[PDB]
Every structure is written in structure tokens, then in C-alpha cells.
UniProtKB/Swiss-Prot annotation:
Belongs to the G-protein coupled receptor 1 family. This is Orexin receptor type 2. The lineage of its organism: Eukaryota, Metazoa, Chordata, Craniata, Vertebrata. The chain crosses the membrane at residues 6-26, 40-61, 79-101, 118-138, 165-185, 404-425, 440-463. It is found in: Cell membrane. Suvorexant binds at residue 423. Disulfide bonds join 78-152. GO terms for biological process: cellular response to hormone stimulus; chemical synaptic transmission; circadian sleep/wake cycle process; feeding behavior; locomotion; neuropeptide signaling pathway; phospholipase C-activating G protein-coupled receptor signaling pathway; regulation of circadian sleep/wake cycle, wakefulness.
Length: 478
């Protein structure tokens, strides 16, 4: 014995050094730089600690056993080292699960460091408890006389128990949390990439020409309106969704007031023929109200956002205030409902918030926007622009971290698939009961791969995380 031995020793050494240095540097990076202190990164630290554990205590023993096919260490270590192995695996899996859970909770339904600490502690306790059977079953057996060798292996009192235990181990440490994390991360993907975001390259002021005053003058001239504060609605005509009913009702409330003559309204969209007719009746009734049911290009809408004073977003429900972001990027000030999404983007410095379906509150907000429009609104518009850009920035960042995490999950799944399938085939379906060197080679490789995962994570952080890469950079600077 044996071929593939030098590549096994070499690979184990490489993995050992890279995993040790790498995960230690991960922990150092998070601990010494405060901007690194996020829930995700605390969890990541936990992961690296588990990896360091299994790297120090299990990897060498595994190399020796896979090389010699014997157990030189004691009975105690024959209990301990497999126990530490399984515990490390459990900690890793549950840590990934808590990461995915955290991201899902923060992204799909918009988590403190204390909560995260509790999560960590729980993870380690659960992991240590559920892996007690592993420690119980492991036994040393003497095989033969001139010599004798001892091997360390699971001792079962039947054929059913190992099958059940390894089914359970496969489900708990691999299959179920993997499935759950996949579901969570695909929902997260759909949320962050497909439903969130904004064409920042299109929705910016650079494409418009002339001052805002000139554009507004052109706007009102084109619409056949006198000068005055201009409000804009763009959503669909629904009852209980985009809230054009709230706006129409509030317009009726305002129409009796003397301030109404100072206001201008641009209501755009299709939908309920009753609401469309209501809009058209209000349009025919008042000269300072214009209704557009026809389809408008993005360029025209962009010009609108860059010309009007305020944009009214009276939604009952708005998970993604993309209209708000588009308008704010072009200097339009939002008067929106305090529903989650608009509630997220807009603050009291970057717009006006109102109760979702209260026409009185909306009319009051419109009046307030008028009195506010009696003076310079520059600072306000700039605040809106910078808030929108900041929000978009945050979305892109969340995309980066989420992609990194997904990649880690994938690499984990890949790294643990072979040993999983092998264990299930051997222990549950009783295969490999008959050419042994091939099976043994597959097993040695699978073991090495499992340990290779631990070295895989930190370099993943290096290539897919700017902050981690920068701290790694600072570390290796001699
Ligand atoms: C070496 C190694 C690495 C990873 C493994 N893995 N499978 C699934 C997840 N991870 C296994 C493995 O097949 N396990 C883990 C616990 N077991 C185990 N035997 C070990 C022997 C040595 Cl020298 C060191 C650690 C040992 O862990 C026996 C039961 C069995 C289920 C073994």
C-alpha cells in the first residue's frame, strides 16, 4: 500500500493549512474590524470555528486511518473524534440554516446580535446533544496468531438500528435543511433580483435638460394648465390596492377649498371603468385636473417625474415602492401611504407619509405640500435623490451578500453529497457487501472532500466579499 497515497497526504496537508489559516483569518477579520459586525458575519464566524475544530481534531486522525486502515488511538478517542466530527457537521448545517433564515426574514419580510448569540448557543447545544448516539455506538474491535490490529467502527446490535440511524443522520445533517435553505434562497432570489431593484442607469436627472422650473413650465404649457404646484398619480385604477379612489375622494374634499385653485393634478392609468369614469367626471368638472388613460413611454414618464412637484402614492398595499424610487431619483417629492415598502424608503426628510386609506389625511398632506411649495424645495428634492440612490445601493449590496451565501450553500451541498450517498448505500441498503479497493478509494476521496469544504469557505469569502478580501489583504501584508 498504496497508490494515490502521496496525493492524499499532499491534499490533506494543503486542506489543513488553508483551512486553519483561512478560518482563523475569518474570525480575526470579523473580531478586529467593527464594520464587519453583522448577524451574517457572526454566524460566519461560528461556521469558521466549527471548521477549525474539525480541522484540528479530526482531519489528521482521518488521514492516518484512511492510510493505514487501523486505529492507533485509544477507545476514548474512538468515541470522541467521530463525535466531534458529527457535532462539527451539525453546527455547520444549522449555522447555514440560521443564516438563510435570517436573510429570509430580513429580505422577504422586513434580527439583533443578541438574537444571533442565542441562535449560536442553541445551535451548539442541540448539536452536542443529538450527536450523543454517535459517541455511544463507536467501539474498538480487535482483529486477528502473531499479530492483531484494532479498528474503530460503529457497533450495532442488529441490522435495523444502523439503517434507521443513518437515514436519520442523512435527513437531519443534509437533506431537510438543504431543502429548506434552497426554498428560502430561491424565494430570496425572486425577491431581491426579480421584484426589487430599479434601472438606475435610466432613472437619473442627467438625461433631462434645463432647470426644473423650465421643465415644469413646459409641462404645464403642454397640458394646458396655469402655473401652480403640480401633483401626479401614475398607478393602476384599483379599489384597495393603488388607492386612486383615495386620491379622487380627497380631490373632491379639496375642491371646495380656496387652495384647490392653486393645485394641479395629473392622474394617469387604466383599470376600473367606474373609477375611470369618476376620474373623467372630475376632469370635466375642474380645469386643474387632467386624466391620462393612454399608454406612456418610459421616457415621457421620466420627463413627468422630473417636471412635477409631488408624486402621490396612496397605495393600500405596496411591497415595492419602485414608483417612489423612480420619482425620487428625478427629484419628485413623494406623498405616500405609510405601508411597508413606501414606509421603508420614505422618511420625514424625504417625503410625506399618510394613513393608507384616509382621504382626509391625504387631502391634509396635499395642503401641507402646497404650503411647503410656497418656498424653496431644493434641499427636499436633493434629499429624495440621495435617499433613493442609497436605497438602491443597499439592494445591490444585499444581492452581493446573498449570492455569496448561496455559493457557500452550493459548495457545501456538493462537498457533502458523495459521503452522504456512500453512507446511505452502505449503511441503509447494505451495498459494498462484496472489489473493495475502489469503494475504499471513493470513501477516502469523500472524506478528503468533506474536509476540503472547510478550506473552501474562506476563499469564497475572499472572491465574493469585498470587505473580507480587504481584511485578508491587510492580514498578509508583511
Ligand atoms: C471521516 C468522516 C468525515 C465525514 C463523515 N461524514 N459523513 C457525513 C457527514 N460527515 C464521516 C462519516 O462517514 N461519518 C461521520 C461520523 N463517523 C466518523 N468516523 C470517523 C472516523 C475518523 Cl478517523 C474521523 C471521523 C469520523 O467520523 C462515522 C459515522 C459516519 C456517518 C466520516
Amino acid at each position: 500500500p498504496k497508490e494515490y497515497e502521496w496525493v492524499l497526504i499532499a491534499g490533506y496537508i494543503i486542506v489543513f493549512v488553508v483551512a486553519l489559516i483561512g478560518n482563523v483569518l475569518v474570525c480575526v477579520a470579523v473580531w478586529k474590524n467593527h464594520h464587519m459586525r453583522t448577524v451574517t458575519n457572526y454566524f460566519i464566524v461560528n461556521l469558521s470555528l466549527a471548521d477549525v475544530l474539525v480541522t484540528i481534531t479530526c482531519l489528521p486522525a482521518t488521514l492516518v486511518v484512511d492510510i493505514t486502515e487501523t486505529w492507533f488511538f485509544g477507545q476514548s478517542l474512538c468515541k470522541v473524534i467521530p463525535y466531534l466530527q458529527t457535532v462539527s457537521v451539525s453546527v455547520s448545517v444549522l449555522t447555514l440554516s440560521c443564516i438563510a433564515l435570517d436573510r429570509w426574514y430580513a429580505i422577504c419580510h422586513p434580527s439583533t446580535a443578541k438574537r444571533a448569540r442565542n441562535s449560536i448557543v442553541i445551535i451548539w447545544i442541540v448539536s452536542c446533544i443529538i450527536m450523543i448516539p454517535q459517541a455511544i455506538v463507536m467501539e474498538c474491535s480487535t482483529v486477528f496468531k502473531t499479530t492483531l490490529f484494532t479498528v474503530c467502527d460503529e457497533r450495532w446490535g442488529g441490522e435495523i438500528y444502523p439503517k434507521m440511524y443513518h437515514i436519520c443522520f442523512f435527513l437531519v445533517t443534509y437533506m431537510a435543511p438543504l431543502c429548506l435553505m434552497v426554498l428560502a434562497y430561491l424565494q430570496i432570489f425572486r425577491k431581491l433580483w426579480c421584484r426589487q431593484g430599479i434601472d438606475c442607469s435610466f432613472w437619473n436627472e442627467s438625461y433631462l435638460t434645463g432647470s426644473r422650473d423650465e421643465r415644469k413650465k413646459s409641462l404645464l404649457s403642454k397640458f394646458g394648465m396655469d402655473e401652480g404646484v403640480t401633483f401626479m398619480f401614475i398607478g393602476r385604477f384599483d379599489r384597495g390596492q393603488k388607492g386612486v379612489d383615495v386620491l379622487l375622494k380627497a380631490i373632491e374634499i379639496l375642491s371646495s377649498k380656496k387652495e384647490f385653485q392653486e393645485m394641479r393634478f395629473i392622474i394617469i392609468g387604466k383599470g376600473d371603468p367606474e373609477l375611470e369614469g369618476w376620474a373623467r367626471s372630475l376632469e370635466e368638472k375642474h380645469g386643474n385636473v387632467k386624466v391620462i388613460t393612454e399608454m406612456l413611454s418610459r421616457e415621457f414618464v421620466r420627463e413627468l417625474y422630473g417636471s412635477v412637484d409631488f408624486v402621490i402614492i396612496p397605495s393600500y398595499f405596496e411591497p415595492f415602492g419602485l414608483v417612489a424610487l423612480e420619482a425620487m431619483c428625478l427629484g419628485a417629492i413623494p406623498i405616500a401611504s405609510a405601508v411597508g415598502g413606501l414606509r421603508d424608503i420614505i422618511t420625514n426628510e424625504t417625503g410625506i407619509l399618510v394613513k393608507a386609506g384616509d382621504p382626509g389625511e391625504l387631502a391634509n398632506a396635499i395642503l401641507k405640500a402646497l404650503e411647503l411649495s410656497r418656498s424653496d424645495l431644493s434641499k427636499f428634492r436633493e434629499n429624495c435623490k440621495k435617499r433613493a440612490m442609497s436605497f438602491s445601493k443597499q439592494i445591490r449590496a444585499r444581492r452581493k451578500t446573498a449570492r455569496m451565501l448561496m455559493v457557500v450553500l452550493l459548495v457545501f451541498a456538493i462537498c457533502y453529497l458523495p459521503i452522504s450517498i456512500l453512507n446511505v448505500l452502505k449503511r441503509v441498503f447494505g451495498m459494498f457487501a462484496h472489489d473493495r479497493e475502489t469503494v475504499y478509494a471513493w470513501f477516502t476521496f469523500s472524506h478528503w472532500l468533506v474536509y476540503a469544504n472547510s478550506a473552501a469557505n474562506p476563499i469564497i469569502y475572499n472572491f465574493l466579499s469585498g470587505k473580507f478580501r480587504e481584511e485578508f489583504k491587510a492580514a498578509f501584508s508583511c
